[PDB]
Amino acid sequence: QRRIKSVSVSLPMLVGPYEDVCAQLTQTSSSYST
Amino acid sequence: GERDISINKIPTFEGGTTGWLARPDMFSRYDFGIEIRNRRLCHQVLGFHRLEALNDRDVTDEIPVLVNRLTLDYDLNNSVSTLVAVRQVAYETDGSPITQPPLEFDYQRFDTGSIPGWQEMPQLEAFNGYQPYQM
Numbered sequence: 683q684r685r686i687k688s689v690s691v692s693l694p695m696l697v698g699p700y701e702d703v704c705a706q707l708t709q710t711s712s713s714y715s716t
Numbered sequence: 717g718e719r720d721i722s723i724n725k726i727p728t729f730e731g732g733t734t735g736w737l738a739r740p741d742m743f744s745r746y747d748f749g750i751e752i753r754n755r756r757l758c759h760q761v762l763g764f765h766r767l768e769a770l771n772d773r774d775v776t777d778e779i780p781v782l783v784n785r786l787t788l789d790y791d792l793n794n795s796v797s798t799l800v801a802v803r804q805v806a807y808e809t810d811g812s813p814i815t816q817p818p819l820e821f822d823y824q825r826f827d828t829g830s831i832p833g834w835q836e837m838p839q840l841e842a843f844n845g846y847q848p849y850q851m
């Protein structure tokens with residue numbers, strides 16, 4: 683069996699010194715009825 | 717640099733009271749775990765033939781004549797020095813120098829006057845300042 687414990691993300695990018703990139707992620711649905 | 721570096725005089729065989737000169741740019745080396753200190757540069761080199769010995773005509777006061785004087789002529793700076801020029805010289809019986817046309821040098825060299833204004837670096841323009849640089 684497998685269940686998700688946690689997640690994180692990483693972006694190969696360049697960013698301005700004090701640029702706060704703004705984006706968001708969301709889950710639509712998941713298998714196994716969690 | 718001991719004898720009078722002027723050309724309008726035959727050098728003396730002896731040096732005179734100058735001694736060898738100083739320099740603006742003395743270096744030192746430690747390539748052996750011990751000092752070397754390097755204070756001197758040439759200015760002239762002189763060729764002498766013991767004339768009355770060679771003639772075998774006299775034995776008292778064998779002053780060789782100067783056949784010719786090499787001139788070794790330098791550019792100077794507080795960190796480096798190098799030849800500007802060299803000449804063959806020899807001396808007439810009236811004591812006039814006679815000289816060959818020199819051989820002359822120049823070297824690409826450091827400067828503080830000409831420096832360019834600064835330029836942007838698009839290629840890298842943000843990718844430094846703590847983590848974003850690695851090289």
